[PDB]
């Protein structure tokens, strides 16, 4: 009775276009009269270890960018770079431009990805920005320029644009101002991601979801303190829990009548003893890609 | 590198409306000049054990249906029943009507759900029609009339309309011609679902996905026969595997160079021995909600 739900994607679908530069095709985001896409579209196979993007962009003309919005070829009238994004000024404002914002999310927050190829949507899924600023995506060749987003009320908040796959098979990209999340650079080089941790406040939200949906076996009569719990968090590579995290969990704590430090004691026992061959919300692992806000939304039926 | 992906929802979003009859509000599907919704919208709390829908519908007038498409109140000019769906004829054809079909899916097939409340989309997720014709949804009060769908090329195939929650907390509903999936009736009565089984051909597709994404530990040098495997399927409540299932798995078998009866031997060992505290594609259970066609799509980047 508790699904990993993505936002409805329609408002984003009408923004996706195909961008080709030479042999390279990827996706762009068409808002008003600008198409946003990863600047690596201007690289050739010879120059991907350490591209001088300033020099490469000077070599390019508007005519070197083929932008297709379904059937419509969409004329580029100017090109500039903002950090690691290319902004292609086009002759037509997108008539399907939604109300939007560009936001830079925090590690641990969730968003929906509209995975695209050749400017065409292929599917939508929810995921988390990992504490080490990577995402565990489903992205193939041609998926670059696919975006992540949230919706609040009538407004699309774009938070992520896809650029690359790291050696470990996880994904890296930028905000819509072209700033990478994490230490990553758009050089096709071996790049270390940090140690990743589990998003504790999300695991606790997901245990609250399980209680709301009648799944209760893991509840114990014990309580803990932030200090004592964090000693166990450190041992199992869980993020430390703060009073802000307890406060954010307040609606779920009130709804269920289970204090956050009581649920922390339950999580402690799960980390120490495992699940003894049992399941929670039809999973045999502790799930960390639901924010408290995602659980409240899905348990209260919030719409857009 | 392998996510449960929903279809892009935009073409469906423009079809969702709010339907109110008395105190009851749920969702409707506005295609051309017809709004489709669950006929139980016409029930009162006194008549939900065994409604005489023919008598109840005769008592209703067009004026007893309030249909809202965002702001627009949308005038009902006729009402009829097709099996367990109400068809409300409206004075305006939906200008956002997509290319569509109504299809009745098979048990074991997947589809996306656009979960709606008050005619407004809340989120989209992928799920399977269980072998016992239930769905393991995420549906709250007010979610009735939310639909399930597939997209092939440019065409929305509607396959499911949500009606009710069964005692076990799983969900039941109809095709868009109003015929229930499974033995269920629109009476708010205790109703048995069959024994459910695991969708073997989907588990094997998902093991092929794991191999494609480098997750390989469970592969063994052994092979089996359909007969010998099915003896183990029966023991663990897995659907029996047919030569049609082997043939459908052919692209995944060819891609990976692993014969279906070789993967069957791997699945046999997983059922008999469990996962020994290991994970496949970041799961500690065998996942059965990916069809062979879903894995091929997600591994080849098919778009719409
Ligand atoms: Na041009
Ligand atoms: Na009317």
């Amino acid at each position: 009775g508790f699904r990993k739900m993505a936002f409805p994607s329609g408002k984003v679908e009408g923004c996706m276009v195909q961008v080709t530069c030479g042999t390279t095709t990827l996706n762009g985001l068409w808002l008003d009269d600008v198409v946003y896409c990863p600047r690596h579209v201007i690289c050739t196979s010879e120059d991907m270890l350490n591209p001088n993007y300033e020099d490469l962009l000077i070599r390019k003309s508007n005519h070197n960018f083929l932008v297709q919005a379904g059937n419509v070829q969409l004329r580029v009238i100017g090109h500039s770079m903002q950090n690691c994004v290319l902004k292609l000024k086009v002759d037509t404002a997108n008539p399907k431009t939604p109300k939007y914002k560009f936001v830079r999310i925090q590690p641990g927050q969730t968003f929906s990805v509209l995975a695209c190829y050749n400017g065409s949507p292929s599917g939508v899924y929810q995921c988390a920005m990992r504490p080490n600023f990577t995402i565990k995506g489903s992205f193939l060749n041609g998926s670059c320029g696919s975006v992540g987003f949230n919706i609040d009320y009538d407004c699309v908040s774009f938070c992520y644009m896809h650029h690359m796959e790291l050696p470990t098979g996880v994904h890296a990209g930028t905000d819509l101002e072209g700033n990478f999340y994490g230490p990553f650079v758009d050089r096709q080089t071996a790049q270390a991601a940090g140690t990743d941790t589990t998003i504790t406040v999300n695991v606790l939200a997901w245990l609250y979801a399980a209680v709301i949906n009648g799944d209760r076996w893991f509840l114990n009569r014990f309580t803990t303190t932030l200090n004592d719990f964090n000693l166990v968090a450190m041992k199992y590579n869980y993020e430390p829990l703060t009073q802000d995290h307890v406060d954010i969990l307040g609606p779920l704590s009130a709804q269920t009548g289970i204090a956050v430090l009581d649920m922390c004691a339950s999580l402690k026992e799960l980390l120490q003893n495992g699940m003894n061959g049992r399941t929670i919300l039809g999973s045999a692992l502790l799930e960390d890609e639901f924010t408290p806000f995602d659980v409240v939304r899905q348990c209260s039926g919030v719409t857009f």
Side-chain angles (χ1 to χ4, degrees), chain A residues 1-220 222-304:
Chain A
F2 202 76
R3 287 279 181 178
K4 194 166 283 166
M5 230 162 300
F7 289 97
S9 62
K11 287 165 180 243
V12 177
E13 289 172 53
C15 307
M16 299 312 301
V17 304
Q18 189 184 244
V19 182
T20 307
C21 189
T23 56
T24 307
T25 302
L26 40 66
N27 307 283
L29 186 70
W30 181 25
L31 298 168
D32 304 314
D33 66 337
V34 180
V35 176
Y36 303 79
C37 73
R39 68 174 175 173
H40 65 60
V41 72
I42 70 180
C43 299
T44 60
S45 316
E46 50 266 32
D47 65 62
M48 281 186 309
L49 290 185
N50 197 5
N52 188 307
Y53 285 105
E54 288 69 23
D55 293 346
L56 295 172
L57 186 61
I58 285 169
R59 279 255 149 204
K60 291 291 176 221
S61 300
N62 296 325
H63 72 262
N64 292 127
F65 300 103
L66 287 41
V67 185
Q68 254 149 308
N71 277 328
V72 180
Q73 169 144 346
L74 169 48
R75 210 166 313 234
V76 174
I77 65 158
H79 56 270
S80 66
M81 192 155 69
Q82 182 183 359
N83 307 304
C84 302
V85 287
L86 186 63
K87 294 190 301 187
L88 300 183
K89 196 187 190 90
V90 295
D91 68 357
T92 312
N94 185 359
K96 294 164 186 242
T97 302
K99 180 90 172 317
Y100 77 93
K101 288 165 188 140
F102 294 169
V103 299
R104 182 163 179 98
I105 64 158
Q106 290 293 299
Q109 300 293 120
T110 60
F111 55 96
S112 290
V113 173
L114 182 66
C116 293
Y117 300 89
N118 302 118
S120 285
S122 78
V124 63
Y125 60 88
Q126 186 79 355
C127 67
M129 182 63 70
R130 300 307 312 164
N132 72 355
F133 288 102
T134 64
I135 74 171
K136 300 195 182 172
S138 184
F139 292 118
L140 312 162
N141 286 342
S143 62
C144 289
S146 297
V147 297
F149 62 96
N150 285 267
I151 311 178
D152 184 12
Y153 184 34
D154 59 337
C155 185
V156 180
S157 294
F158 293 104
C159 56
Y160 179 81
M161 172 159 279
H162 186 51
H163 289 239
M164 67 199 190
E165 181 174 317
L166 298 178
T168 61
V170 303
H171 297 109
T174 64
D175 67 23
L176 268 292
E177 292 188 323
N179 301 110
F180 266 90
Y181 292 97
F184 311 114
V185 296
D186 49 359
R187 298 180 52 186
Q188 208 178 262
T189 194
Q191 291 180 55
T195 306
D196 200 29
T197 56
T198 304
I199 309 156
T200 309
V201 62
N202 291 3
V203 176
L204 292 166
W206 173 81
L207 295 172
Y208 279 110
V211 170
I212 287 167
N213 285 274
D215 227 317
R216 281 196 79 87
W217 58 262
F218 51 80
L219 293 181
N220 65 31
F222 308 119
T223 193
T224 190
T225 68
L226 289 178
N227 251 6
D228 297 325
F229 176 82
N230 287 339
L231 255 184
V232 178
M234 189 95 69
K235 177 155 145 68
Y236 292 88
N237 292 114
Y238 270 57
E239 283 198 301
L241 201 72
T242 70
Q243 181 66 37
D244 284 351
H245 293 147
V246 177
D247 291 334
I248 289 158
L249 288 167
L252 297 176
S253 182
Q255 279 168 55
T256 59
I258 303 172
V260 171
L261 296 175
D262 183 335
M263 193 66 85
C264 280
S266 308
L267 178 51
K268 180 174 161 231
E269 168 174 343
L270 290 175
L271 290 176
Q272 289 177 341
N273 306 337
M275 316 218 342
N276 259 101
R278 296 203 280 311
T279 65
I280 304 176
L281 283 179
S283 168
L285 302 172
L286 299 169
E287 298 297 331
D288 83 336
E289 291 200 317
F290 289 96
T291 71
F293 303 108
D294 295 338
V295 177
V296 159
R297 285 190 301 103
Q298 181 170 165
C299 292
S300 70
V302 177
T303 57
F304 305 102

